[PDB]
Amino acid sequence: SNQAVKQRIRAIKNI
Amino acid sequence: PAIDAGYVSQVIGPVVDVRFDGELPSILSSLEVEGHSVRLVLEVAQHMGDNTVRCIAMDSTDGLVRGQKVVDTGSPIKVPVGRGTLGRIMNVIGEPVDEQGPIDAADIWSIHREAPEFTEQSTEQEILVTGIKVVDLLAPYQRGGKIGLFGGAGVGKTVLIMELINNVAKAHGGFSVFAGVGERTREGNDLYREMIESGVIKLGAERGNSKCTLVYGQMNEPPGARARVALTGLTVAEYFRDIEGQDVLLFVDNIFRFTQANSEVSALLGRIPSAVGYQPTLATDLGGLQERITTTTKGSITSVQAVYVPADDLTDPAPATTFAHLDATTVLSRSIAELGIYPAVDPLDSTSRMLNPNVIGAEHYNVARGVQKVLQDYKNLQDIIAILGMDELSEEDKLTVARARKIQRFLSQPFQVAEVFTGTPGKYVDLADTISGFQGVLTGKYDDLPEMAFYMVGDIKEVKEKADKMAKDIASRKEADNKKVSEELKDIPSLDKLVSEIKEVVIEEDDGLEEDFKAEALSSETVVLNEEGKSVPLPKKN
Amino acid sequence: QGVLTGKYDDLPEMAFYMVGDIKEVKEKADKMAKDIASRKEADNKKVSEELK
Amino acid sequence: GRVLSVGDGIARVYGLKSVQAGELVCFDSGVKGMALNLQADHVGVVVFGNDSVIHQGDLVYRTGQIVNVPIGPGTLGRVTDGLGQPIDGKGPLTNVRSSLVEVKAPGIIARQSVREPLFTGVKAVDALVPIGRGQRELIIGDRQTGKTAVAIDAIIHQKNCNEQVPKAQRVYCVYVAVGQKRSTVAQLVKLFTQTGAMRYTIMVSATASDAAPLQFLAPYSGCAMAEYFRDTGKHGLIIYDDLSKQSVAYRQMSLLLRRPPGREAFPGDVFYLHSRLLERAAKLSKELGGGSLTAFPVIETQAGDVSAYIATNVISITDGQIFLETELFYKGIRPALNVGLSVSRVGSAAQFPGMKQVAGTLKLELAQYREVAAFAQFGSDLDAATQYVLERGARLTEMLKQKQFAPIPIERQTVAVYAATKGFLDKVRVQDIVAAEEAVISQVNPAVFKILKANGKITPALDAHLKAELRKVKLPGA
Amino acid sequence: ADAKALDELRKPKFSSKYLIQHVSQKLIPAVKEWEKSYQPPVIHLGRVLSVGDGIARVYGLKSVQAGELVCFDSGVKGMALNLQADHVGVVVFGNDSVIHQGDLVYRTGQIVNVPIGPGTLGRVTDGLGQPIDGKGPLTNVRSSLVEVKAPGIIARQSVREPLFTGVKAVDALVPIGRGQRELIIGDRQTGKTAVAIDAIIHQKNCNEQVPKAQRVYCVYVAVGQKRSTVAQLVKLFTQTGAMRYTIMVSATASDAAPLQFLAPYSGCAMAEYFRDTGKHGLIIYDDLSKQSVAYRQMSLLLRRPPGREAFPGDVFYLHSRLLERAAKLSKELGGGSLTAFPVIETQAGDVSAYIATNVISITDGQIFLETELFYKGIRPALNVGLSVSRVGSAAQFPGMKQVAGTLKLELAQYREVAAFAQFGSDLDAATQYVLERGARLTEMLKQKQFAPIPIERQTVAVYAATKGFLDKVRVQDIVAAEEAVISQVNPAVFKILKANGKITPALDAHLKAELRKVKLPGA
Ligand SMILES: Nc1ncnc2c1ncn2[C@@H]1O[C@H](COP(=O)(O)OP(=O)(O)OP(=O)(O)O)[C@@H](O)[C@H]1O
Ligand SMILES: Nc1ncnc2c1ncn2[C@@H]1O[C@H](COP(=O)(O)OP(=O)(O)OP(=O)(O)O)[C@@H](O)[C@H]1O
Ligand SMILES: Nc1ncnc2c1ncn2[C@@H]1O[C@H](COP(=O)(O)OP(=O)(O)O)[C@@H](O)[C@H]1O
Ligand SMILES: [Mg+2]
Ligand SMILES: [Mg+2]
Ligand SMILES: [Mg+2]
Numbered sequence A: 001s002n003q004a005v006k007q008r009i010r011a012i013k014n015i
Numbered sequence B: 001p002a003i004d005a006g007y008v009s010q011v012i013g014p015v016v017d018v019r020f021d022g023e024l025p026s027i028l029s030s031l032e033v034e035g036h037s038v039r040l041v042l043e044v045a046q047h048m049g050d051n052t053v054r055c056i057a058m059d060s061t062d063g064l065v066r067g068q069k070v071v072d073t074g075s076p077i078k079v080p081v082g083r084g085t086l087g088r089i090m091n092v093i094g095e096p097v098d099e100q101g102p103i104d105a106a107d108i109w110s111i112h113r114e115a116p117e118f119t120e121q122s123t124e125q126e127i128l129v130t131g132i133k134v135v136d137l138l139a140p141y142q143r144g145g146k147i148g149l150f151g152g153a154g155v156g157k158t159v160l161i162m163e164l165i166n167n168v169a170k171a172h173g174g175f176s177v178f179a180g181v182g183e184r185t186r187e188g189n190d191l192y193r194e195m196i197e198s199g200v201i202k203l204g205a206e207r208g209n210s211k212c213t214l215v216y217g218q219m220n221e222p223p224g225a226r227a228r229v230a231l232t233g234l235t236v237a238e239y240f241r242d243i244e245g246q247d248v249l250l251f252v253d254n255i256f257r258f259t260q261a262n263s264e265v266s267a268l269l270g271r272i273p274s275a276v277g278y279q280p281t282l283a284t285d286l287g288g289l290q291e292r293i294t295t296t297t298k299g300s301i302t303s304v305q306a307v308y309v310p311a312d313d314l315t316d317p318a319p320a321t322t323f324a325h326l327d328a329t330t331v332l333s334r335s336i337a338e339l340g341i342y343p344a345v346d347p348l349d350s351t352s353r354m355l356n357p358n359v360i361g362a363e364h365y366n367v368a369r370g371v372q373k374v375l376q377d378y379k380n381l382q383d384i385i386a387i388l389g390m391d392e393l394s395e396e397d398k399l400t401v402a403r404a405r406k407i408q409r410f411l412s413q414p415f416q417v418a419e420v421f422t423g424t425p426g427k428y429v430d431l432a433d434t435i436s437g438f439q440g441v442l443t444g445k446y447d448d449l450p451e452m453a454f455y456m457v458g459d460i461k462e463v464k465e466k467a468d469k470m471a472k473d474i475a476s477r478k479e480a481d482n483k484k485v486s487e488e489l490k491d492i493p494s495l496d497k498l499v500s501e502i503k504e505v506v507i508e509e510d511d512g513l514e515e516d517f518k519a520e521a522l523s524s525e526t527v528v529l530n531e532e533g534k535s536v537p538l539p540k541k542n
Numbered sequence C: 001q002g003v004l005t006g007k008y009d010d011l012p013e014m015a016f017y018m019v020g021d022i023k024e025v026k027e028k029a030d031k032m033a034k035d036i037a038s039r040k041e042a043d044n045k046k047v048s049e050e051l052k
Numbered sequence D: 001g002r003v004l005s006v007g008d009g010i011a012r013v014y015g016l017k018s019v020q021a022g023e024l025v026c027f028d029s030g031v032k033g034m035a036l037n038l039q040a041d042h043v044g045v046v047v048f049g050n051d052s053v054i055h056q057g058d059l060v061y062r063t064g065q066i067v068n069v070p071i072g073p074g075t076l077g078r079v080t081d082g083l084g085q086p087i088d089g090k091g092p093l094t095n096v097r098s099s100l101v102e103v104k105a106p107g108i109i110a111r112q113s114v115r116e117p118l119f120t121g122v123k124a125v126d127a128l129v130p131i132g133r134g135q136r137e138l139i140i141g142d143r144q145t146g147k148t149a150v151a152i153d154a155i156i157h158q159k160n161c162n163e164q165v166p167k168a169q170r171v172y173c174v175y176v177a178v179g180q181k182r183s184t185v186a187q188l189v190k191l192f193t194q195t196g197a198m199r200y201t202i203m204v205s206a207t208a209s210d211a212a213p214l215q216f217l218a219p220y221s222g223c224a225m226a227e228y229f230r231d232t233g234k235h236g237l238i239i240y241d242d243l244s245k246q247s248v249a250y251r252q253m254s255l256l257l258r259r260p261p262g263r264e265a266f267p268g269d270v271f272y273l274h275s276r277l278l279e280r281a282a283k284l285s286k287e288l289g290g291g292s293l294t295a296f297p298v299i300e301t302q303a304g305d306v307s308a309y310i311a312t313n314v315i316s317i318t319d320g321q322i323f324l325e326t327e328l329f330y331k332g333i334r335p336a337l338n339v340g341l342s343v344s345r346v347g348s349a350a351q352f353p354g355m356k357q358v359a360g361t362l363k364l365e366l367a368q369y370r371e372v373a374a375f376a377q378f379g380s381d382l383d384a385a386t387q388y389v390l391e392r393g394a395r396l397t398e399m400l401k402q403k404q405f406a407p408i409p410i411e412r413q414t415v416a417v418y419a420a421t422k423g424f425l426d427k428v429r430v431q432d433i434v435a436a437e438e439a440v441i442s443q444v445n446p447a448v449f450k451i452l453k454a455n456g457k458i459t460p461a462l463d464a465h466l467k468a469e470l471r472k473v474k475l476p477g478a
Numbered sequence E: 001a002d003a004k005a006l007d008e009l010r011k012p013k014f015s016s017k018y019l020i021q022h023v024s025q026k027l028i029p030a031v032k033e034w035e036k037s038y039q040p041p042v043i044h045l046g047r048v049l050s051v052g053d054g055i056a057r058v059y060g061l062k063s064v065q066a067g068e069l070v071c072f073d074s075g076v077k078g079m080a081l082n083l084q085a086d087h088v089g090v091v092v093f094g095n096d097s098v099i100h101q102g103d104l105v106y107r108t109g110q111i112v113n114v115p116i117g118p119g120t121l122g123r124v125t126d127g128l129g130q131p132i133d134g135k136g137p138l139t140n141v142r143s144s145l146v147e148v149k150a151p152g153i154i155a156r157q158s159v160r161e162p163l164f165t166g167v168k169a170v171d172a173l174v175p176i177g178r179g180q181r182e183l184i185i186g187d188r189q190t191g192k193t194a195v196a197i198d199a200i201i202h203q204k205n206c207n208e209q210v211p212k213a214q215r216v217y218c219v220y221v222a223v224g225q226k227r228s229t230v231a232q233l234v235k236l237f238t239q240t241g242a243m244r245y246t247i248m249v250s251a252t253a254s255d256a257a258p259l260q261f262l263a264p265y266s267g268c269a270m271a272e273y274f275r276d277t278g279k280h281g282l283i284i285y286d287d288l289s290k291q292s293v294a295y296r297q298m299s300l301l302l303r304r305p306p307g308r309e310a311f312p313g314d315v316f317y318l319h320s321r322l323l324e325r326a327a328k329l330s331k332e333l334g335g336g337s338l339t340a341f342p343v344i345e346t347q348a349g350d351v352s353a354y355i356a357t358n359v360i361s362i363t364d365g366q367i368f369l370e371t372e373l374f375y376k377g378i379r380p381a382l383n384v385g386l387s388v389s390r391v392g393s394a395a396q397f398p399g400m401k402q403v404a405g406t407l408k409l410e411l412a413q414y415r416e417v418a419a420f421a422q423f424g425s426d427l428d429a430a431t432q433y434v435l436e437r438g439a440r441l442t443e444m445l446k447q448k449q450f451a452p453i454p455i456e457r458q459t460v461a462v463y464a465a466t467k468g469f470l471d472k473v474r475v476q477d478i479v480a481a482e483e484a485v486i487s488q489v490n491p492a493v494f495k496i497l498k499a500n501g502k503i504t505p506a507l508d509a510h511l512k513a514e515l516r517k518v519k520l521p522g523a
Helices: A002-014 B133-138 B157-171 B185-197 B204-209 B223-242 B256-267 B282-290 B317-325 B334-338 B362-388 B395-411 B431-443 B460-473 B495-499 C022-037 D123-128 D147-162 D182-195 D212-231 D243-256 D270-278 D309-317 D326-330 D359-375 D386-399 D411-421 D430-436 D448-455 D460-469 E003-010 E020-024 E027-032 E168-173 E192-207 E227-239 E257-276 E288-301 E315-323 E354-360 E371-375 E398-420 E431-445 E455-466 E478-488 E492-500 E505-514
Strands: B005-012 B015-019 B030-033 B041-047 B052-057 B069-072 B078-081 B107-110 B146-151 B175-181 B212-217 B247-253 B300-308 B328-331 B527-529 B535-537 D002-007 D010-014 D023-027 D032-038 D043-048 D060-066 D068-071 D097-100 D137-141 D171-178 D201-206 D235-241 D292-300 D320-324 E046-052 E055-060 E068-072 E077-083 E087-093 E104-111 E113-116 E142-145 E182-186 E216-223 E247-251 E280-286 E337-345 E365-369
Touching: B015 B041, B052 B223, B078 B223, B107 B223, B133 B362, B133 B395, B133 B431, B146 B157, B146 B317, B157 B175, B157 B185, B157 B247, B157 B300, B175 B185, B175 B223, B185 B212, B212 B223, B223 B247, B223 B256, B223 B282, B223 B300, B256 B282, B256 B300, B256 B317, B282 B317, B282 D243, B300 B317, B362 B395, B362 B431, B362 D326, B395 B431, B431 B460, B495 E492, B495 E505, D023 D043, D043 D212, D068 D212, D097 D212, D123 D359, D123 D411, D137 D147, D137 D309, D147 D171, D147 D182, D147 D235, D147 D292, D147 D320, D171 D182, D171 D212, D171 D243, D182 D201, D201 D212, D212 D235, D212 D243, D212 D270, D212 D292, D243 D270, D243 D292, D243 D309, D270 D292, D270 D309, D292 D309, D320 D326, D359 D386, D359 D411, D386 D411, D386 D430, D411 D448, D411 D460, D448 D460, E046 E087, E046 E104, E055 E104, E068 E087, E087 E257, E113 E257, E142 E257, E168 E398, E168 E431, E168 E455, E182 E192, E182 E354, E192 E216, E192 E227, E192 E280, E192 E337, E192 E365, E216 E227, E216 E257, E216 E288, E227 E247, E247 E257, E257 E280, E257 E288, E257 E315, E257 E337, E280 E288, E288 E315, E288 E337, E288 E354, E315 E337, E315 E354, E337 E354, E398 E431, E398 E455, E431 E455, E431 E478, E455 E478, E455 E492, E492 E505
Parallel strands: B146 B300, B146 B328, B175 B212, B175 B247, B247 B300, D137 D292, D137 D320, D171 D201, D171 D235, D235 D292, E182 E337, E182 E365, E216 E247, E216 E280, E280 E337
Antiparallel strands: B005 B015, B005 B069, B005 E077, B015 B052, B030 B041, B030 B069, B041 B052, B041 D002, B078 B107, B527 B535, B527 E104, D002 D010, D010 D043, D023 D032, D023 D060, D032 D043, D068 D097, E046 E055, E055 E087, E068 E077, E068 E104, E077 E087, E113 E142
């Protein structure tokens, strides 16, 4: 659940 | 007389070791400390192994000397039970803390007992109408069910438990028990005074016509008191269930404080800590307390427990453990509360065992599942809406976002207990009106109405009333220009005529500080006790 | 090296899926083309008056 | 032996010098125990019950015997506690025999390959993640998904199949209820009675008020009651409801026996806790009887976090995985099966041959549905065949929905996925595909279900007859 | 080795005494020749076994109470936390670098107590009651315990009296009852201290106009702050005159973590003197989030198991047994009150922290102070959508209650239309009206430091804003407009509004009249 947030930061930063 | 009167061996906070030179007390037995300033009851927790028992103090241990005589009572903590406890306030050890005299005891029961057996259980599912829109629609309550209100410090589970008291505990014709565990003492005084006002609690010779009994272990109590006061309130409820044989309402404000109190205690008992910081026995202590709160074949206990979540963390072990003990879990969210929606009930996190079409009927069930489907679809759209706006959505998506905003505002409701600080009078919404209104907002019968017409109204008649009123006002904003009742000669004095009617106060100039103050003579040297217990100055040596 | 150097851009990309080598890509692309150009073979029969 | 100390359900016992590890001991209070860590100075005894009746200096007698439960056909119909003793109020277990709860699992030579299908009656399971006999399948999900409801439907469906199969291939179910409410399991005995599944069901009930060694040991007691049917040529179905609540009961004893904690607080041997237990679910060889035991461990996650300690252990042990999602639950998709994450390692080896040739196309299309809906919810553009796959995959998503306690047999499941994948449910509106498919089962002739049950496969002489029968149906909306 | 087998060794079973008598004639002369190396034996006194991390282990002290002030022979106080079978673990109220192994510990016979009374009023003390302002010992004072239990249910009544803070945002929006507990929660440098300082200065301004029983005696508890900050605050309280009514307890950042843990209890025992004798107290625990950090230090140095974030698990009980003593007593107990302002610093606005959500579920409301409002100059940066005070509501100033419901509603609609349009391009011209009214009102409520306003001059100032009377003024000159309104309004109406309690219709008539002959600077 700590890697869901890191990939969500990845998604928001690429968007 | 010396044997079975042991002595205090070591004192570590709420935890006392007592050594008994012969015939140790049993685990869960009550022990009395002789010579304390107050009545200090110690409940035996463990046998340490060398004629020593390990105890939990029900009051403060400040003042315990390491030889103090501790008297075994041979039995656990027994509290007064019966119809004579109705209308009284009790603490953890069953004493009256309301200054009304001693408690009329039909019996005195130990607060430790086993859960009812598997044969004693009751499998009956009838709904409990609460008059709350989101509660009755999406996670309906069972009349003999364990109900949990899950919340994160300021989201509204005391206000929800007070509204449930006001709605349910008057139509429900049984007795109530309010077990206040680890909450504010101000709130216990508030509930006590508002129950004396509405006649639920009656004082004096009318005391037998009371309907509620209060047990209080509030947040100023030591950890041993807050760890056992829920068992006292359970014992009072279990007498009415098992002996009087009738329906009880048990409201427990913050059953989390039971777990937190045992977690404070468990550090000093020499246990290896479990997850996040808790005792290794979280599940079994909580389950042993929770499995006593049931309806059996001989009586009913409808239980409402507020459950605190520690840092808005629903995965913390105490909320995650207590989720499996409830029939209806109403989870309150802070994000719902920050949108002004009250009660802040997360509709996609609140569940019941009653949301089943064979139990509530297919009309109610289909409306509830359709409401949840619209809300979940909006939740899936919110990540797009926050970035790309509502201009990028489909027309189908715009329709479900508009409908879901309307059914989000429509789940909010004014409470009768919230009207003293909100000012808006509260509404009791019947279940049939809830089902019909939410079905109409689902099918698209009320797309003509704006979003804010649904906010803080009772039922769908009041949405249309508020939608006419918001629209009607859209014009009426002026013509308070002249033709007043506030010009100089309407009924008005002059200003200096108003000044002379002021009651002048006399300011006393001396603060009243030394009225009866007995100042003791403080020594300019530290006075200590020498080897002979005599008060001497501190000797000038290091 | 064929797929990398633009040599097989005439084929569907699903002819590459679950095949042996580059000749089975060509053996699946023509098999696939015949299969979807002959969807229209059973729209006229097998609804009535079958072979019993 | 003398009790040195007692507290928290652990009694440290002096003496008992010839006691075995894991041996049942008896206190003089009548409450039992189990010697778990034998040390040089004392014995650590976990107490099977309330430890308030044990005092310092109490006498502990060793029973001589390792922990055992009554197994046999006399346990069928009954509701027992964590060790055998019936709690339903129907007297003793007649026609029963004691055997140990910790039996070594059958080795390599004692097995054969999992080939017979276990029909759950849940078509999201029986099509996409099918389950063979002897396969252990994890039902993992978040807090209130449909985890028990998948497992109750697998038990109720075995009652519907046991009336129709011969006596040899009947599946006898065992539901182990660990750490639950006692009234939650009273609602299941009432449900298994009024369906009739209690004729074939054993319920091993270690509720939340039972002691922590009774909830740790109840999956092993239920596995031993279900290994009776495996070892004597019959077929068993064991369901361990919340193995994540058994490991919390194991962590409690391990932390109170002062065994040093590891991850989150759990003991080191908590993988060995569950792999000892799930490896006892096997399909035996024909020399040993051909018997079978199918496991359904249930694991509850916290926020959809399958990366937990106990979650990643049981994912690593079991063959398949039925991952239930709380966001799919509220979209209407119930059973809330994540079809992209749910596996079956037996796979096409032990499913229905009549649905092996239909549900190959079903997962081939639903894999195409998933990525196109991630794009088309932004609302950029659509492509008249990308429009086809998110319109067809909505026909299949609504097809795999199901009601609560109605398991669909196997033939009415494969006719419905036939009518959804052979195009017969195109141009039917998406809202009543859940309502059209009762007509596809009721109006289609009841004797075409017998042929697909007896053949087990869509023969060439049957697809031409069935697709002639899927045209003479009156579909809603249309 | 069974205790059954160690109990039989009390009975003599030697059956020969040929070296009992040999050493019993020789033991005393051998002990006598080593008397230079014997420390004197200790029974009722104590001797330090081991000192370290600010916790001493003390041998002896056979008759100490649990929780008792002990005194090391170097004059440093301690508190007997845990009495064990072999030692006493004491907690050193001071630096442990002056305690040695072998030092004498003296029992004092009293559980940990501070000097309370009228004579501590005006003084600056440390966390245990010894003065640090240098003007001599505490005279006209008596000793009372610091760990008193809070009053029960029957000893309280609901809060009725309205405890004016002097801040327009607080007294209008988040009003404070007189036995209430109000959390001032915010980030670092968001004006948390400034609200509490303004409340203390306003009590100085109100104490000289009320008759001797409606006076509020403030207590400022500064835990974990710098000492220069505390010196500047004592200078401010002295030059405003507010030190006549204030006690100032300070356990600064250099002090020991036991003193920082104990200083709010010391200040609470000093303010409970005013609660218990019928007067009214105000107590400000500045950074209760630093008392929690000092208690976490003490607990991890005592090797207690850390819980969430590292905190001991009874860090809820630490603050709950502190703030529960802020009560409003019943008339049978004198009718005194004690109002608490706990202060909790929040990291980056995270209200979902451990100690923050602990103190939120103890206190009766919150005052949220945001960095995004504080950086924009809206000071006090009160988050009106999150700040709340439910016990002080319907217990506030009646004229302010008549005016401020419209203010709460208009700021609510201002928050709604700023939640809709964070960029300005689509103007409804009725949404422009609620935007202009909200911008007028949020310029009205923001005020300057160290100058609290009386409640009638806030009632008139928000009366002139929630109505018309200020729409001529644009958005900038409102700070001068309200000063022109306070200046040019005839000051009799302030006396009528103070004396009557609310705006009577005659006073509403004179107030609508007087707000028209006011020369607004926006013209
Ligand atoms: N297929 C389904 N269709 C409709 N409703 C369902 C379905 N499955 C489950 N539900 C509903 O969801 C609720 C939760 O089901 P279930 O009891 O299986 O939860 P769970 O996953 O076992 O969680 P827990 O163990 O916490 O109870 C039940 O009340 C049931 O009514
Ligand atoms: N109402 C106000 N108007 C103008 N300036 C203010 C106001 N309140 C505070 N300030 C200024 O903001 C700064 C921070 O104020 P304050 O010390 O009250 O915040 P704080 O929350 O105590 O910060 P910290 O806790 O870190 O000391 C001070 O320098 C002060 O001058
Ligand atoms: N139904 C409601 N209507 C209006 N305000 C509410 C409602 N429920 C909660 N609140 C607000 O939330 C605050 C906290 O609620 P409370 O129940 O006291 O918190 P907790 O959940 O911590 O017990 C209350 O002071 C109240 O202002
Ligand atoms: Mg509360
Ligand atoms: Mg379940
Ligand atoms: Mg500050």
